[PDB]
Design a protein around this ligand. Structure first.
Ligand code: MG
Ligand code: MG
Ligand code: MG
Ligand code: MG
Ligand code: MG
Ligand code: MG
Ligand code: MG
Ligand code: MG
Ligand code: MG
Ligand code: MG
Ligand code: MG
Ligand code: MG
Ligand code: MG
Ligand code: MG
Ligand code: MG
Ligand code: MG
Ligand code: MG
Ligand code: MG
Ligand code: MG
Ligand code: MG
Ligand code: MG
Ligand code: MG
Ligand code: MG
Ligand code: MG
Ligand code: MG
Ligand code: MG
Ligand code: MG
Ligand code: MG
Lengths: 294, 169, 145, 139, 159
RNA sequence: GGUUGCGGCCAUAUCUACCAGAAAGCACCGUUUCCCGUCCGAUCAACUGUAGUUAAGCUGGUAAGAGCCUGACCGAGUAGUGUAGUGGGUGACCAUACGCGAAACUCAGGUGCUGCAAUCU
RNA sequence: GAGAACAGAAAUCUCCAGUAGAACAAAAGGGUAAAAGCCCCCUUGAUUUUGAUUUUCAGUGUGAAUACAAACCAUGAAAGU
RNA sequence: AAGCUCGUAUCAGUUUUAUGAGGUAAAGCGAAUGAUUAGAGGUUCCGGGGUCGAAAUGACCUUGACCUAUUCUCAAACUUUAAAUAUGUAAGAAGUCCUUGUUACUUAAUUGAACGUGGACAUUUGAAUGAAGAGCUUUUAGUGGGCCAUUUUUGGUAAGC
């Protein structure tokens, strides 16, 4: 745009770290999650990474190494069909389930699963998972929100709630769970439980049903197709916890074709570049083209 | 080619550069409230300038930002006032465009002599779908070269609906 | 000054043997204006050791006048004659450190016949005395010994 | 230069700029050597060995006239300055054989008094527009 | 009058490297430090807390303490005709494992090993480093390399 | 091999322009009951994955492309420098002896590599 | 830079480019870009106890400063600070 | 000066090897900041003075300002690069490896962290050169005007300043 960059501008320009350029990692936050007290030596600080894509919920227990971050365990809302949930796969309730799943999943693999049940009950009341006496302290993890905004009622703290209720020690506070009243400075646990089991989606389903068969029919095309009536959402989620606590272990997809087969096709849609000689030829040609005034 | 990427109003920004603080500015703001149906925002002077009679941090002007179908209706009203004719200036190099009217009663709007008469700037910014890319928190990016609004493209858009006249060069 | 002492050269015309390696070669460089050096022949070594060989034995400086004296201090490394000594010097080799150190610094006279240049304190390359004069050290030492 | 050969027969260039400031302390009873830092007195050029002071370009025809300008000029400067005639085409550079090979090739474009040289480095596009003569049928 | 503040004379010393300003990469915070480690001190002027005074720039000492955010380091400083022992509390941004203690430990292993294969063969070892030795005789051939003879070159001006 | 999440080093990765991208992913993208945030559901929050699209993002290719990287008896053993002399020179300064040794220049080559976990004709 | 009634060189409103060319009380230098800058929300770690340590050094004092220990607090979802 | 504790030792105004730190010399300026000579081209559709219909809200002008690619020349308080000389640390018995003890610290965790028991490895045991012995304690004299030379270097026209 005649806003051209002088070769001097480019030459002195210092680039941000790669992941900064690409808008993914906040480094000020990362320094503070990751850095360990120097006299706890190689004790890993462990983050509960929670991200949302437009269609999936990612949940990862990650730690740090100069040579790269290291995942202990991972869970994804896309897993949830295995345990009964087939819709609203990025809603709060799934965030809760996914946080539960990751919790039971890692501390299964940690040995820690029987000692440290979690809550099992679930009325969504504020409580941290507190340590047994004369036994192992709970496995402790710190929420990594990434770049997400801390809003009071955010999905991300759903994953926190599931994972805390899962038996992980994840330090937190009530004031961002839905149901926190800023005037009251209290948390109505009624509301928070409702979210855990999807109440907010369920009530909407009913209102819409009664007030707009048509729009209800698009937004809930799926539920219609599966004969899922609305006031059975709670069962779906309640029964989903059962399932998840019953069997948190990771089963990987069944996998048509091998990493090799994938490789030989899957980006031999990849443009292959020229050798310094082909380039020369192109150069010499282009001139013969361009030479002769106009 | 052309499927998605249609072209549209991002927003309409009505601005009344009032020039002073107090009743007159609160009066003008009422015009924007009673018109946008939103509540307008007030600008403070960046610096003192004796000969204009304004002190730094004194509230001089009000504006209000409008979007979607309502902004499109207010735009139309304005165009009416200028008899569907704008000038080939008017349109920015980067695809937006604007105009101003004197006396706001020229677009609906009774008279209520406790309000009075105000002229106003009209600025309408054009984008496409996918602007979010440059506006969102995570993975903020830049819109591609093709894609992205231009004076040519948006002048022609504007001639073509609105059935209007650009003018001069 | 330090180097001169670590090489046991703290008196004019006194002389010693140095095994050449990188760690010693950089010493000879630092010192070059103050010494004359080169590659001694067997002849020269034989005569340096016969005429002016003295050994170090509880500090004291002791003339090597019987092989018994050499064996009594250097026997523990092989080396039980004055010719055993010369051999560990000329072939360098495994106890050179210990053999060479046992030899006190050689006390030479001024050269009989002169330095052969109008001025000693320039380099041999520049007209004379000081620095590595290579093989020509034998002629110089022979006239000093 | 101008009277013997004309207001126009040469290009003379003072190749040295008097950036260094000299000081005088400056004594006006008398103050002393107390606080003797000087005031600025004058400017000078710091010149080196083999460093060029003046350059002149003319036509081969004018060599002798030129040298005499620079010979007449020495008498105004402290020190020893030599008059060297250069292999090199005018103020450019490149010995005349290498400059000539170039000009007879199209590689040289006249700029503002000086000149621009065809590179093998930028964009093909606009080096072709810049040096048409270089790649053209032409004679 | 004269001026000798704490960061006096430090304009180029505490400056950041060209095109290397800004956040400090996490590797720095992931190094672990132990009492007895050997670190090199080098100030990062973008981190003003836990900062070595400029006398210690470029100096190497031993870790004597480990703390939430810093190591304590022992430096031996010469004052007068005698070294005094100094201890510093540097934050970790300003410290770095001494790379030569690493070659050294590597060699100690290499040494233990060389000793092992030697004993489990019952042979002599030779484990200490010799310096660069004189150079043994060679025969250079002339096949394809008949010596090219050169002469000095006449003076000439290029100006 | 592609793609995603979390990364290490932090341009061989950035910049400008033009192409191309199967599959999955990612994305844009539809909605506003709910928690939540706006002058503005644009951003931020939530909801559907349903109506749509590879246009953009993103990935890769092109370029006697700007930059960045690497090499070289390219310049140059030059500039500068440690040491030596009752060396030269009125001086400015310079040469020689034992050593150390650049930068710009020029030309050649190159344009991310990689760890963990998941997934894909 | 390109755009918008009264509006002008200079008022307010879009968009594009933008490695910092700004801002950070003050001299200058260093340092900083999802910040250390700008806007907002909550606050009193500018607190309590008494040791070690760096600079200046005699390795005295003083000023300043660094990292811990033991309290009591602030903030934040949290790691932390 | 008085000794004392020991006795080949760990020493050292030195080299080598390995690994750091540094921003001076030089260099650079069609690289950032600052300075500086010259044209060239293009912009102003947004500073200006005319002549062309007073005309000008219109052309071609020369003149600034600015932009692009060049050009000659510079920096103690400029710089991407960047020496030489000087400079920190290391080159092991207070070491290495194996086994498994203690704790109130620390960890999800007998997990780490410290300090240890027991077991193994002494020819070159971990570069060079030298060591005229190493280590240590008390006490006290004089001094506390300095000056000169090579080299680096500041003020000054300079000075046996
Ligand atoms: Mg960079
Ligand atoms: Mg659903
Ligand atoms: Mg919310
Ligand atoms: Mg698979
Ligand atoms: Mg002398
Ligand atoms: Mg020599
Ligand atoms: Mg792969
Ligand atoms: Mg790596
Ligand atoms: Mg809503
Ligand atoms: Mg809204
Ligand atoms: Mg939307
Ligand atoms: Mg959102
Ligand atoms: Mg995208
Ligand atoms: Mg993306
Ligand atoms: Mg691309
Ligand atoms: Mg290129
Ligand atoms: Mg010299
Ligand atoms: Mg000299
Ligand atoms: Mg002579
Ligand atoms: Mg001399
Ligand atoms: Mg010289
Ligand atoms: Mg010279
Ligand atoms: Mg030599
Ligand atoms: Mg180099
Ligand atoms: Mg390469
Ligand atoms: Mg890894
Ligand atoms: Mg995974
Ligand atoms: Mg380089």
């Amino acid at each position: 745009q005649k806003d051209a960059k002088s070769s001097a501008y480019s030459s002195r320009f210092q680039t941000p770290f790669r992941r900064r350029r690409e808008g993914k990692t906040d480094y000020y936050q990362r320094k503070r999650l990751v850095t360990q007290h120097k006299a706890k030596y190689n004790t890993p600080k462990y983050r509960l990474v929670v991200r949302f894509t437009n269609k999936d919920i990612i949940c990862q227990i990650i730690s740090s190494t100069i040579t790269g971050d290291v995942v202990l365990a991972a869970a994804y809302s896309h897993e949830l069909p295995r345990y009964g949930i087939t819709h609203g796969l990025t809603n709060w309730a799934a965030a809760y389930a996914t946080g539960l799943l990751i919790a039971r999943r890692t501390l299964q693999k940690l040995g820690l699963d029987e000692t440290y049940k979690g809550v099992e009950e679930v009325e969504g009341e504020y409580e941290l998972t507190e340590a047994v006496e004369d036994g192992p302290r709970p496995f402790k993890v710190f929420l990594d929100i990434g770049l997400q905004r801390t809003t009071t009622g955010a999905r991300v703290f759903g994953a926190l709630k599931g994972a805390s209720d899962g038996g992980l020690y994840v330090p937190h506070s009530e004031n961002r769970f839905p149901g926190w009243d800023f005037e009251t400075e209290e948390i109505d646990p009624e509301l928070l439980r409702s979210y855990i089991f999807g109440g907010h989606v369920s009530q909407y389903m009913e209102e819409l049903a009664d007030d707009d068969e048509e729009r209800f029919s698009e937004l809930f095309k799926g539920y219609l197709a599966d004969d899922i009536d609305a006031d059975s959402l709670e069962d779906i989620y309640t029964s989903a916890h059962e399932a998840i606590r019953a069997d948190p272990a990771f089963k990987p997809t069944e996998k048509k074709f091998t990493k090799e087969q994938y490789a030989a096709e899957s980006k031999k849609y990849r443009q292959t570049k020229l050798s310094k000689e082909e380039r020369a030829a192109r150069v010499a040609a282009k001139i013969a083209a361009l030479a002769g005034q106009q | 080619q052309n499927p998605m990427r249609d072209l549209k109003i991002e927003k309409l920004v009505l601005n009344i550069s009032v020039g002073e603080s107090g009743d007159r500015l609160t009066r003008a703001s009422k015009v924007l409230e009673q018109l946008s149906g939103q509540t307008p925002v007030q600008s403070k002077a960046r610096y003192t300038v004796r000969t204009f009679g304004i002190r730094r941090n004194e509230k001089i002007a009000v504006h209000v930002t409008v979007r979607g179908p309502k902004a499109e209706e207010i735009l139309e009203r304005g165009l009416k006032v200028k008899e569907y004719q704008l000038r080939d200036r008017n349109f920015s190099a980067t695809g937006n465009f604007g105009f101003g009217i004197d006396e706001h009663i020229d677009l609906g709007i009774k008279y209520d002599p406790s309000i009075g008469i105000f002229g106003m700037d009209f600025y309408v910014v054009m984008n496409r779908p996918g602007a979010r890319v440059t506006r969102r928190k995570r993975c903020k990016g830049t819109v591609g070269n093709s894609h992205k609004t231009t004076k040519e493209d948006t002048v022609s858009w504007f001639k073509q609906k609105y059935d209007a006249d650009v003018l001069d060069k | 000054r330090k180097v001169l002492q670590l090489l046991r050269l703290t008196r004019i015309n006194s002389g010693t043997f140095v095994k050449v390696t990188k760690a010693t070669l950089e010493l000879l460089k630092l010192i070059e204006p103050y010494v004359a050096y080169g590659y001694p022949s067997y002849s020269t070594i034989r005569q340096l050791v016969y005429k002016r060989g003295f050994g170090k034995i509880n500090k004291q400086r002791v003339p090597l006048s019987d092989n018994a004296i050499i064996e009594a201090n250097l026997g523990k490394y092989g080396i039980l004659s004055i010719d055993d000594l010369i051999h560990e010097i000329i072939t360098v080799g495994p106890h050179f450190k210990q053999a060479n150190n046992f030899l006190w610094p050689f006390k030479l006279s001024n050269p009989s016949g002169g330095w052969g240049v109008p001025r000693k304190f320039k380099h041999f390359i520049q007209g004379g005395s000081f620095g590595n004069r290579e093989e020509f050290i034998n002629k110089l030492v022979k006239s000093m010994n | 230069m101008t009277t013997v050969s004309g207001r126009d027969a040469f290009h003379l260039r003072v190749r040295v700029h008097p950036f260094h400031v000299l000081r005088i302390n400056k004594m006006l009873l008398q103050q002393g050597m107390r606080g003797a830092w000087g005031k600025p007195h004058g400017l000078a050029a710091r010149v080196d060995i083999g460093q060029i002071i003046f350059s002149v370009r003319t036509k081969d025809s004018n060599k002798d006239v030129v040298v005499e300008g620079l010979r007449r000029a020495r008498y105004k400067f402290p020190g020893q300055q030599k008059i060297i005639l250069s292999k090199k085409w005018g103020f450019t550079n490149l010995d005349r054989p290498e400059y000539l090979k170039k000009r007879e090739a199209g590689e040289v474009k006249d700029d503002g008094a000086f000149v621009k040289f065809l590179s093998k480095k930028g964009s093909l596009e606009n080096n072709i527009r810049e040096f048409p003569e270089y790649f053209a049928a032409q004679a | 009058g004269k001026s000798h503040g704490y960061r006096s004379r430090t304009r180029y010393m505490f400056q950041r490297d060209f095109r290397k300003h800004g956040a400090v990469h996490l590797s720095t915070y992931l190094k672990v430090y132990k009492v007895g480690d050997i670190v090199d001190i080098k100030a990062n002027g973008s981190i003003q807390k836990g900062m070595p005074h400029k006398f210690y720039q470029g100096k190497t000492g031993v870790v004597y303490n480990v703390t939430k955010s810093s190591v304590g380091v022992i430096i031996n400083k010469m004052v007068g005709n005698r070294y005094l022992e100094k201890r510093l509390n540097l934050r970790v941004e300003h410290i770095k494992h001494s790379k030569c203690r690493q070659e050294f430990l590597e060699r100690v292993k290499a040494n233990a090993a060389k000793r092992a294969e030697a004993k489990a063969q019952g042979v002599a070892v030779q484990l200490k480093r010799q310096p660069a030795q004189p150079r043994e005789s060679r025969i250079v051939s002339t096949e394809g390399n008949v010596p090219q003879t050169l002469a000095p070159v006449p003076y000439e001006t290029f100006i």
